Amino acid sequence: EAERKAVQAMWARLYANCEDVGVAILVRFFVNFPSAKQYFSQFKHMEDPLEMERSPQLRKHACRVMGALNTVVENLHDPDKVSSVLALVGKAHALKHKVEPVYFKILSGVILEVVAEEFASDFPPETQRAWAKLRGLIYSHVTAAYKEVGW
C-alpha cells in the first residue's frame, strides 16, 4: 500500500511539469503501436509524430487519460474510488469505442517507460515495482469492467 506515496509523489511532479507528457505518451504509443490509431477519426491516417503531436483529438484524449489516471493515483487509498473510476472508463471504452482491452495494458506499459525515463537514478529499485503494481490495478480493473459488460 505505502509504496503508493512513492507513486503519488512521482506522479504529482509528472502531472504538473507543463512539458505535456500525456501527449508524449500518446504519441509514443501510436508510433510503436500504429494499429491503435483506427479508433480515432482525426488521426487514423497520420504517420508523422509531429503531425500527431499537433492533432487536437490526440491532445484531448491524452488529457482525458492523464486526468483519470491522476484521480486513480490520487486515490489509491480508496479501493472503491479506483474501482469506480476505472470501471466507468472500461465500460465506456468497451461499449462505446470497442477498444481491444489489451491496449490498456500496453498503453500502461508505455506510461511505465516515460516515467522510468524521467525519474532519475530516481526511477526505482523496488518502486519500479510500485509502478508495476499500479500497472496491474489499471489493467485488472479495466478487464473486469469489460467482463460485466460482456466482451
Add this chain to the structure above:
Amino acid sequence: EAERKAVQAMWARLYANCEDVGVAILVRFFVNFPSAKQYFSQFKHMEDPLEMERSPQLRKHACRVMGALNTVVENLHDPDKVSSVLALVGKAHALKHKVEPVYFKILSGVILEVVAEEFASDFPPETQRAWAKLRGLIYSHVTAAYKEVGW
C-alpha cells in the same frame, strides 16, 4: 472566506474539462491586448488566433499560468501559501520578464470572463463577487511582489 468554496468548486471543474481553457484564455488576452505579445519570442508576430492556439510557447505558458492559479485557488485557505506562490511569480515576472504589472490585472480580467461565460445561470450573483475578490488577491499580491523587488 467561505465564498472560496464557490470558487474552489467552479475552478476544479474548469481546470479538468480537458477543453483547454488556459489556452482559450491566453489567446483571448493576446487578441484583445496585442501589446502583451512582445514578451514572447515565438509568437510576438502572430496575428491569427488559430496560429496562436498552436504556438508551443503560448501553450506552455497557459499551462504555467493555470498551474499556479490552481495552487493559489486550492489554498485560499492558507494566506501564506498564496503569498508565497504569487510572490515568486511576481518576482520572476518583474526581474526576469520585466512585464508591466497592470497586465496581471488585465489577464485576470480575461479569466473572469471566460469563467462567467462558462458557468451558467451558474456564474454568480454575489459570487461573480468571489471571483472579483480573488482577482484582487492575485493583483495585490503580485504588485507588492513588484515592490519588494523595486520596480
